[PDB]
């Protein structure tokens, strides 16, 4: 009886500190387990994840890691906050876990993905999503995990960016583990193995708004590869100078496939399933729909930038200097350490970290 | 145009 007193969690055994209390879980990922919390300390629920199994592989590790030093050093308001970290195992030597303690918002965008909006809900909504995205970017840092689950809502409409364990620099696009990406966001140059830059995350955000308008998934798809098939049954097959980048193996495979000319957007998002149009001419269903018609675009060098994106008439209403341009996160350069060290060295920097961060 | 206030997730 320290202080830490321990719970049965659904599957898995929660060993924390005694200002949280009641728990309860919320959401179990590819990357965590986390609960809801009171904190008697702060006297306000707070949101507990416990990084599931932080050392089976270097992979898991400089997972845990990167979530770890963004979490510290990345700070806008759009960007969820890092309320406490901690560990309650008490040496090096005895230490497996790493608990991180963040801000507890109201819902998900699963939500409100599951109610009707208004042009000015559904517009700032966008604008802060992408004010917080606009943070990453300017730092080169690339979310690559964006979905409805990881964007979180209070009920005063504001709205926060969260989970980065999967963040990093542009480059090469072979992860590992790719299943702990969800598919139905997984952009072209994520596919089909090209390279990616940070417009990546912008095709993950033009899927997530047309299901907000659309309220279903845009592109399903049953598999890895079917993913594929949906986005250019929607879209159109890509034009030959797009092929030409395939690595030479997925390229063969792109061309044997169907062609298709894909469908107008607006036969992709009739007015009907818009917010309602008021007589105003930025926040009008063909402004969203243009701006949707921009990010939705597979060969990402013709896609929208979050730069043009921040500054489309559908968006634009609510621009602020102060949101839009903040000065760019800093980061200590163990992140630039983006080198491949072992299980055992991993839990070296972790343990440090957790400590000089409790 | 003035952000919203509320928003009903309920
Ligand atoms: C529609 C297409 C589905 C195919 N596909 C994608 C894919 C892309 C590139 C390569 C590749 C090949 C040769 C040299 C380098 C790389 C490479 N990888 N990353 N960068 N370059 C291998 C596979 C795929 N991926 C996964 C993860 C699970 C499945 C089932 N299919």
Known sequence: ?????????????????????????????????????????????????????????????????????????????????????????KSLEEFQDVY?????????????????????RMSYLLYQMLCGIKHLHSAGIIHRDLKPSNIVVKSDCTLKILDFG????????????????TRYYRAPEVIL?????????????????????????????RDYIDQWNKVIEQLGTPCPAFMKKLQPTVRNYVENRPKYAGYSFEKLFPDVLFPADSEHNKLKASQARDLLSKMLVIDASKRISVDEALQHPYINVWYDPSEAEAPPPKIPDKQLDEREHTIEEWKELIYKEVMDLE | PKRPTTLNLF
């Open chain 1, 1 to 89: 009886d320290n202080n830490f007193y321990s719970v049965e969690i659904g599957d898995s055994t929660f060993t924390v500190l005694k200002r949280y209390q009641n728990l309860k879980p919320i959401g179990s990922g590819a990357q965590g387990i986390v609960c809801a919390a009171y904190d008697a300390i702060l006297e306000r629920n707070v949101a507990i994840k416990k990084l599931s199994r932080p050392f089976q592989n270097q992979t898991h590790a400089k997972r845990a890691y990167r979530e770890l030093v963004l979490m510290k050093c990345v700070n806008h308001k759009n960007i969820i906050g890092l309320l406490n970290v901690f560990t309650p195992q």
């Open chain 1, 100 to 120: 991180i303690v963040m801000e507890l918002m109201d819902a998900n965008l699963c939500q409100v993905i599951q109610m009707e909006l208004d042009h000015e």
């Open chain 1, 166 to 181: 999967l963040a990093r620099t542009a480059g090469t696009s072979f992860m590992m583990e790719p299943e702990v990406v």
């Open chain 1, 193 to 221: 193995g090209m390279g990616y830059k940070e417009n990546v995350d912008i095709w993950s955000v033009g899927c997530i708004m047309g299901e907000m308008v659309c309220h279903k998934i845009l592109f399903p798809g």
